[model samples]
Target chain A: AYVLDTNVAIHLRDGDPEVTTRVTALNGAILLSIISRVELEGGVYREAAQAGLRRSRLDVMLKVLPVLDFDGAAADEYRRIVESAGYSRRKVVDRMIAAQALAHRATFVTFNADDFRDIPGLSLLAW
Target chain B: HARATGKTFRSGNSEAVRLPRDLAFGADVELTLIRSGDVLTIYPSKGSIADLVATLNQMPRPDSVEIRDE
Candidate 1:
């Protein structure tokens, strides 16, 4: 039903009730960029280093959301995005996920819609 | 108090000021900027939907605006 950006995935893992309720309201499959898996794993380790939180339930969380591949179609979208003006200002991971969303024509779900604004033809929602 | 200074620089059309390390907040911060005469103040933004609605409410309304009665 949606392509979830990393922060939304993290919020789901942390049991943010608002995020959880909205996600359930969608009543459809949740897709994620493979890049988000990488980001989330890095965040888990960063937490361990910063706060001694050596724990992750990512295995279970990931089980529900299928990781979408950045294949040929996504590559085309990525190229267009990179060539566009102001694209360089956004984070690389966000661009990658945005490109993937473009390829899939899926609504992108994130907590920071402002960061992803102005990308042509990409539908974004925040929770 | 810890003291440090940074210069303002241009990013595209916007002027960006780098905050001192002691003044830095977390990434993904939502800021609300208020300009009153010459002074500008920024506060960490509150609710997202409320903020969006409040901003829209500030738009100038024209008495001659059209409405469709479908």
Candidate 2:
């Protein structure tokens, strides 16, 4: 299974051909972390007037993806991944997203490069 | 299991319940409801793996039930 990063998910929704090809290859095994969901929802709630159009697209994207929660195992993984590491200290939400993928042993797929900054035991794919 | 007490609202042929943040689920997830006597049991819709296990558990032995191929 592949856990898509928030930016990767946006690309997938916005019809990025490369993202589409990757998602199609993985098919039903694609998953979205709840951390990504929070970020996407934050975007939706940013502007009240445009929420209608923004919401429809987000809803459609969410409907197709199975969201994985950052559960106890992920929390533990995050603790381990962070306690020893000092460089990947910033972007708390990104670490949490990575934790979910680590806990599930799923490949972390992203279009953003910085997200994969020297993490142990993380299966990652950058598009 | 996570549990919290919260009041439910009844408004004109519809009701809304405030799910506690601790026990909340993701957006647009379908829920299955079961009520018996004074208790109501709610279940979040499960994934494909769970679906298979549940179907297997609920079905009778293969010898007892008729089987047909599509």
Candidate 3:
């Protein structure tokens, strides 16, 4: 399973030419975190509804993606990675999401490569 | 996390950051906001990586699933 990130969500929502094709091709247990959900909805609501999307849909797309929690397991993982020397200190939620991936046994999928590189045991899908 | 706990907003420098606020009568602790997948977290300064790992390694006991129906 892969946890889709905000950029991916934006791509899907906006129907960015590449995203539409890729997301359509992606078939698996795909998930996104609650933070991404907020970003997508908040962004669309603020941006006046998909000036970028083909369908330019908002509410329906959200209904489909499963949102995961940042629970105790994720918290523990956050602790593990943040203290490591390789990764620079990160903003809290980013660490938690990486932690959550470990918690749920899922790989993280995102466009933001620089941010997540330091994490170990994290398989990444860059699109 | 600290990022999700504090007020979340996008900063000019970063796409998002926690807006600083006074809590408990002017405590100086800084708050940072961050997003993950769909998760939003706020933290009062990042926790020490060493501290976090040590704590997590101890691994707290989990409650049993059996329903007592108390």
Error of 3 at A76 (Å): 1.7
Residue by residue across B1-70, what tens digits does model 3's lDDT show? 1111455466775665434453231458675544444544444654789867765544533455578889
In candidate 1 chain A, where is summed lDDT lowest over 10 consecutive residues?
A47-56
Candidate 3, position A68, lDDT: 74
Model 1 bad stretches (over 4 Å): A49-56, B1-70
Tens-place lDDT digits, model 2, residues B1-70 = 7767777898775987777777777679888788899998787855442342333334322221111110
* TM-score of each model, in listed order: 0.58, 0.58, 0.56
Please report, in order, the local distance difference test score of every candidate based on alpha carbons: 0.70, 0.68, 0.64
The B-chain TM-score of model 1 reads 0.52
> Which numbered prediction scores highest in lDDT against the true structure?
1
> Which rank order by TM-score, best down to worst?
2, 1, 3
* Model 2 pairs in collision: none
- Candidate 3's DockQ is 0.06
After superposition, which runs of candidate 2 have C-alpha atoms over 4 Å from their true positions?
A45-50, A87-89, B1-70
Task: Give the alpha carbon lDDT tens digit for every residue of A1-127 in model 2.
Answer: 8898888766554444455555666634778999888777766645565566456656666765788977999999888877867545455778889889999989998865565666788888877
Encode model 1's per-residue lDDT on A1-127: one tens digit a residue.
4788888888877668888888877854578778887877777777555323323467777666667776666777777766552457447778888888766666899888987765666789876
Docking class of 2: incorrect
